[PDB]
Paper text:
Ung inhibitors (which are interchangeably referred to herein as UngIns) are DNA mimetic proteins utilising charge-based alignment with the Ung DNA binding cleft to dock Ung. UngIn protein structures described to date fall into one of three observed folds: Ugi/SAUGI (note that Ugi and SAUGI share the same protein fold at ~12% sequence residue identity), p56, and Vpr; yet, within each fold, type there is pronounced sequence plasticity, to the extent that the unambiguous identification of an Ung inhibitor in any genome is rarely straightforward.
The sequences MCUGI1, MCUGI2, MBUGI, SYUGI, and JMUGI were biochemically validated to act as UngIns; the sequence MCUGI1 was also structurally validated to act as an UngIn by co-crystallisation with SAUNG. The structural conservation between SAUGI and MCUGI1 variants is observed to be close with RMSD = 1.005 Å at low levels of sequence identity (29%). Just five such positions of negative charge are common to both sequences, of which, three are located within a 10-residue span in the Ung-binding β-strand 1 and α-helix 2. Of eight residues comprising the Ung binding β-strand, 24ECESIEEI31 in SAUGI and 24LTEFVQLG31 in MCUGI1, only a single glutamic acid residue is common to these variants and five residues comprise non-conservative variation. The Ung-sequestering hydrophobic pocket of SAUGI is formed by six residues, of which, only three are identical in MCUGI1. The other three residues forming the hydrophobic pocket in MCUGI1 do not align either at the sequence or structure level with those forming the hydrophobic pocket in the prototypical SAUGI, although residue side chains do occupy the same position in space. The surface negative charge distribution of MCUGI1 is somewhat different to that in Ugi, Ugi-2, and SAUGI. However, common properties among all these four Ugi/SAUGI variants include an invariant glutamic acid residue, a conserved acidic motif, and a spatially conserved hydrophobic pocket.
Numbering used by the authors:
A (entry chain B): 2 to 15, 21 to 61, 66 to 117
B (entry chain A): 1 to 215
């Protein structure tokens, strides 16, 4: 609920939500420009997509029980607010979501 | 051949007693989905010699009034989850028909074995029942269908499904395979994949009646 609430409050202002869980090849996600982080290549990752039937979808990815992705979708267009490779954050916009890295090591 | 013979082989090849005793405690000391009676609803409604098509899901829906024993299906009254909304958009494009019911019981009747790879889950806990022996069970089910059926379509959505290609004798059987119909994946090529028509082209081609996907 910690990261879920924040990520949802934010996207609204720029109502409630349920959670769909799916395992995906890292590859299945829309990287677009970005090479897939080396330490993630060929990973099966747990994804939690938040939704309701007023509808745009937010989500969180994880791998070996560590948050690795946070993003939203709008058809073909995914954006990542957060990309981590297990070892280090490569991209962050958590400040938008009023979240720290330490809000992630602690949930 | 009947599921009960196949189930007998699998349950004698491996010792699911530890799993059975476990799920007994779970169902009497937890809220587990689906209903104990519906764990095999897929096998119930798609008898072994009626399998034309196999669609793998992963995990049963962990929410209330969702899971009833078929991959992707929620109870009639329930509301559409994402993967399933997208499955219907692609069906609308591929085949033409627009399904209103998020219940896939009629697909089961029509010969689509809607098999999740794990068949139980605790309410709210997303991967609660991984690694209790279900995956072994469902692996032997994909194997069994490959082994004792002659011409069957396997639709494999997302990488986890596609790890099951090594169970499927594609000398004997078809494999239609794409990224998962999750909104996160759907646009890296599930949309436009047209697996419903493809499945039927293949079935028509081995002199089998095609799947009616619609209501």
């Amino acid at each position: 609920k910690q990261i879920k609430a924040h990520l949802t409050r934010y996207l609204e202002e720029i109502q409630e939500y349920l959670t769909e869980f799916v395992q995906l090849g890292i590859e299945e996600l829309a990287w677009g420009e970005r090479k897939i982080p080396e330490k993630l290549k060929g990973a099966i990752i747990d994804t939690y997509t938040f939704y309701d039937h007023s509808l745009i979808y937010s989500f969180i990815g994880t791998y070996q029980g560590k948050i690795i992705l946070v993003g939203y979708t709008n058809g073909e267009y995914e954006h990542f607010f957060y990309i981590n490779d297990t070892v280090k954050t490569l991209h962050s916009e958590l400040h938008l979501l009023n979240l720290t890295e330490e809000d992630l090591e602690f949930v | 051949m009947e599921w009960s013979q196949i189930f007998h082989d699998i349950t004698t090849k491996h010792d699911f007693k530890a799993m059975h005793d476990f799920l007994e405690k779970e169902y009497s000391t937890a809220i587990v989905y689906p209903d104990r009676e519906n764990i095999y609803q897929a096998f119930d409604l798609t008898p072994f010699e009626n399998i034309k098509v196999v669609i793998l899901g992963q995990d049963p829906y962990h929410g209330p009034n969702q899971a009833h024993g078929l991959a992707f299906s929620v109870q009639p009254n329930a509301k559409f989850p994402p993967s399933l909304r997208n499955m219907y958009k692609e069906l609308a494009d591929d085949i033409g028909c627009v399904r209103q019911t998020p219940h896939l019981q009629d697909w089961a009747r029509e010969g689509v074995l809607l098999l999740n790879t794990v068949l139980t889950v605790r309410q709210g806990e997303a991967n609660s029942h991984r690694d209790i022996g279900w995956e072994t069970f469902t692996d032997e089910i994909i194997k069994a269908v490959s082994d004792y059926k002659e011409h069957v379509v396997f639709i494999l959505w997302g990488k986890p499904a596609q790890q099951k290609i090594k169970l499927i004798d594609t000398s004997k059987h078809c494999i239609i395979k794409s990224v998962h119909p999750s909104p996160l994946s759907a646009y890296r090529g599930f949309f436009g994949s047209k697996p419903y028509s493809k499945a039927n082209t293949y079935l028509e081609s081995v002199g089998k009646s095609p799947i009616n996907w619609c209501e």
